[PDB]
Structure formats: C-alpha cells, structure tokens
Write a structure and sequence with these properties.
Chains A, B: Dipeptidyl-peptidase VI
Strand order of the largest sheet of chain A: 18-23-19-20-21-22
Keywords: cysteine proteinase fold, SH3-like barrel, Structural Genomics, Joint Center for Structural Genomics, jcsg, Protein Structure Initiative, PSI-biology, hydrolase
Strand content of chain A: 35-45%
Assembly: dimeric
Number of domains of chain A: 3
Shape of chain A: globular
CATH class of the largest domain in chain A: Alpha Beta
Bound molecules: chloride ion
CATH topology of the largest domain in chain A: endopeptidase fold (from Nostoc punctiforme)
Entry title: Crystal structure of a putative dipeptidyl-peptidase VI (BT_1314) from Bacteroides thetaiotaomicron VPI-5482 at 1.75 A resolution
Number of helices of chain A: 6
Number of strands of chain A: 24
Structural class of chain A: mainly beta
Oligomer: homodimer
PDB class: hydrolase
C-alpha cells in the first residue's frame, strides 16, 4: 500500500520518539536513532514505522527521510561514522567553535564523507553536511574490528550510564526505561534484542536462580514481576543486568546499582521480593530469532 | 489539604525529571524540571504531585525528588550553587574525568558548591551524593549571575547553540524541547522563567500587531501561531518561535531549526506563515509582570 518512493526511511534526528498513535498526545512506546534504517508501514500526516527490532510506532513526518528501496540500500551500504560517546555535537566546519548542525548520542550513525584535521566529514540522511570529532566517534570498519561483545565489556558500558534519568520508553543515552537501558547498552556493542521486557524474558537460556545465586553469571539479565500460579502465567514488569555478588544495574528513577542482599545499603526490597528468573543471552547473538548484530540484521542489508 | 511538614517541599535530584498529567507512566508528559530545582509538594499517592517555580503542576515518581521540610528547603535554596552552563556533561566520583561518573548533567542544572580541586568544583546533590564537575562546563552562581547578559542578542546566541536538537513533546531541557519548551530552555540558561504553555506565553509582555513588512517586530520578540479570532471564537494558540529579524525565526518542530516568513528564502515555512497571529515583546518586562521573573526574584527560590 505505501508508494514505492516512501516504502523505506532513515531517521535523521539524534533520537526520534515513536508513539502508540500518530499524535503527540499518545504515549511514547520506543525511540530510534540518527541513521537507523526503518520500514515505512503507513502515512496519515505521521508515519507508522518499523525499526530493526521489528517494533512499530508512529513519528511526525519531519523526522525521517522517506526513500525508495534503491536509495535505502545505498544508505545502508555506505561506510558510517559511528558515535561512541554518550553526548556530543556535529559542526558546520572542522572546528568545535563553529556553528553546530545537531546534537548526537552514542549509536548515531552518519555517512562518512572524508576527513579534515581532528574531524570526520559526515552527511545526514536528509542531505545536511557536517564535521564530527574523532574523539567522540569512529569509522564503522575500525569500530567493528575492535568491538568486544563479552559480559565484562557490556557491564563496563552499563556503568558509564549510572545516574542517567529514567524515561518511560527511553531508548538512548538521553534517558532510558528498564528494557531501554539493556537495549541502549547493547546497541553500543552492535547488538539488537527485543524491545519490551516481556519479550527479552523469552530469548536466550532461562536460568532458575539458586537460593545462593551461585548459578547466575555477570551479564545475565534478571527479570521481575508476578510469579506464575496454577491459575495464571507469570507477568514480566521489570528487568536489570546482573553484576555478580547479588548486585544488579537497572533503570528505576535513574540508572543505579541495587542488591538482593539486605547487608548492602543499595538493597532493593521491592524488586528482591519480585525476582522471577535470570536469562543468559550473550552467547546466542545471531543464533536465535530476535537477537542479532547490525551487520546480520536484514533491515541493514539488501534482501 | 496540605502535606505533612517534613514533605511539603522538594528538590529535583536527577538531571531532568518527567512530569506527567497523572501519577502513572502511561499518562502524557506535561513538562520537565531540572536537577537542583526547588518545587512545592502538593500530594503523595505513590507518586508526587509537584509545583515548579513557573506554577505548573504535574506528577513524578517518588524516587526522583528529595522531599524536605521548609527549613531544609530554605537551606538548599540559600546555599551557593554550581550552575551547569554547557548543554551536556557528567559529574565524577573523583576530580578526574576518567573516573566513575555520578550522573549526567544538562544546562540549567544546579548543585550545592562544596569546594574546589584542580579543574573541578566539588558539588553535592539534594539527596546527598557527592561529586566533581569540570570548571569548563559550569560556574559558581555568584560569578555566573554577575556576568549574565539578558538582552535579545545574548538570548538569540544561546538559541543558535540548540539548532538540530530534537523536538520532544513537553521537552523542557537541552536533551529535547517542544515549541514553548525551547523558549523556556533558552531563557533558563539566562536565569529567566516565563509561563510553560505557549497559550500562556502569548499573554505576557507587550502584544505586537505585526506590520505586513515586519518593520515593527524586533529580534528577541516571540511569534505566535494558531487559529485567528473570529466573531464567534477567540483565537487559539498552537505554536511559538523566537524572532531573529529579517523575517526569520527559530522554533522547535521535528527539530530546532530556522524558518522564514519570506517565500524568497530557502527555509520559507508556508504552513506556519499562513497561521502567524501576532508577536510579543517580553524581555523588557522580566520581574515587572506576574509570571515573568529571574530565579533570584522567584519566591520558590527564596524564604517567604
Ligand atoms: Cl518517566
Ligand atoms: Cl517489579
Ligand atoms: Cl515528540
Ligand atoms: Cl501553526
């Protein structure tokens, strides 16, 4: 049903806000990043789009660049500059005292157009030209080659997000919700998993937590909610990343460390009482439906 | 009914908090408040209903504000602050930007000044966390107040540093702004507070009936858009921008960008030009009219 020239799109602002309906007065459901490819499902004045995690939501028409399959594939083939710092800006000139073009957040990706001084020349999906510092970003080839995707590397990135505010449906370094924290940290390591905590709970290996937590490893996810009964199936309401020694990092009010041990000052009584199970998912990236890297994700590739 | 004395007041203790229509995440965001900002606590249901220094009300989760007695609130407000002047940054556990971070910060954040070390200021949060913040992204409140420029040129200079920042409905920080939130974010970096909604900003300051050639509109005036008044219906305000002169204006729509009323300009905005209603001159009337003030003249920041 979508015309051929607008069946695809690329986000062209640092962070766009996908909503339940095509209006600002509807709840935000997730967020997409600068340079991210999307499928365009419908147009009503707003676009209904589908992100590479298969999540759907609505955005204002001015935040995405609609494209033909040919132009979309061309965008995806071009080597990117990947933003690696949480926050920064792009500039009109290779000088950070020059006029800015936009803010950027980690995970943003722009087309690499060249180099001048300490900057990379970049272009936006809409056609804007800018310069970005080599100290906050790096070429996609270089970045992919040095990428670490182990539990220790992912936990190191999670600690750089401590104190960042909680934001319902937040999916960027600007602000995150419980499942959005997991997604933001993983995207900085080129990984995509399902958006909702209820869907993250059923990917990877389910771990039945031992009373002393001896079978839970660093990098496992911990899930919270309503325990299953004979009459009702379990309900997932929250998620965190396990750090070992009965501690976990999560987003609640802000990103912070909590504990299942009442000796710890950061003991979280409410969530300890609602702990259901853990999941081991990092060994199964690109080995199970819904868990992949962007160079294995069909939204980023011709098909 | 008033709150218990120990929770009648509060201070935001995260960089940006998200105030909603109701005490639940599945209600729309209405505005945002910043780290160190004093608030009045109206009720508690598991969430707090709070009132910010622009008299706007909204709901926040209990974990993002520090509730206080009037005595502790006045003590927080009296303490000289470190004012964050850069759009984005972080605080650290040590006076070293390679050390563990405590939180992100945004411009307009204010923390209690606790000393100095190397290139850092020692600071404390309303909840009690201690950190270090670079002198290159922040400054002591006394020095900041003394060097502050609140003229149209200085305010436009700040607005240009926000170009390309995303639009966010109810966005009221450097992270993302709506049309009226852009005006408020830029003004707060100049110590100024005006009403939150575009429909309330439209009726403060002097109303300017725009001349066809825009010869009576000045840089720093606000431009308002919406539905023109008819004999049966009063005007409706739907959008706002900041006038830059030469028939150009800066506004938040999709992102922060410059648009023009002139069809000869590359950035001509046909839709918004057709719905332009009037302008307002408000910068001469700060602290001279209800709803427009500076934080050292705002009663939420002072004992009363
Ligand atoms: Cl929120
Ligand atoms: Cl829970
Ligand atoms: Cl929005
Ligand atoms: Cl309009």
């Amino acid at each position: 049903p979508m015309p051929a020239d607008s069946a695809y799109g690329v986000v062209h602002i640092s962070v766009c806000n996908m909503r339940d309906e095509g209006k600002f007065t509807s709840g935000m459901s997730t967020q997409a990043l600068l340079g991210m490819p999307v499928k365009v499902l419908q147009y009503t004045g707003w676009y209904e789009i589908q992100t590479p995690d298969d999540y759907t939501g609505w955005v204002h028409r001015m935040v995405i660049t609609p494209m033909s399959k040919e132009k979309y594939d061309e965008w995806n083939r071009a080597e990117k500059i990947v933003v690696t710092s949480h926050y920064g800006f792009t500039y009109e000139k290779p000088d950070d005292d020059s006029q800015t073009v936009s803010d950027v957040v980690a995970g943003n990706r722009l087309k690499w157009e060249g180099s001048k001084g300490h900057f990379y020349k970049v272009s936006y999906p809409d056609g804007r030209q800018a310069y970005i510092s080599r100290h906050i970003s790096q070429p996609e080839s270089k970045w992919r080659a040095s990428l670490k995707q182990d539990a220790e590397s992912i936990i190191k990135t999670a600690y750089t997000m401590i104190g960042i505010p909680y934001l319902w449906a937040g999916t960027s370094s600007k602000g995150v919700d419980c499942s959005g924290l997991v997604r933001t940290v993983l995207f900085m390591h080129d990984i995509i998993i399902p958006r909702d905590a209820s869907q993250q709970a059923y990917v990877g290996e389910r771990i039945e937590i031992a009373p002393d937590f001896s079978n839970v490893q660093r990098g496992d996810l911990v899930f919270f909610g309503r325990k299953a009964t004979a009459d009702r199936k379990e309900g997932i309401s929250h998620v965190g990343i396990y750090l070992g020694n009965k501690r976990f990092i999560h987003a609640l009010g802000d990103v912070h460390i909590s504990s299942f041990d009442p000796e710890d000052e950061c003991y979280d009584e409410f969530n300890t009482g609602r702990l259901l199970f853990a999941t081991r998912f990092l060994p199964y990236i690109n080995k199970e439906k819904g868990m992949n890297t962007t160079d294995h994700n069909l939204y980023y590739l011709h098909h």
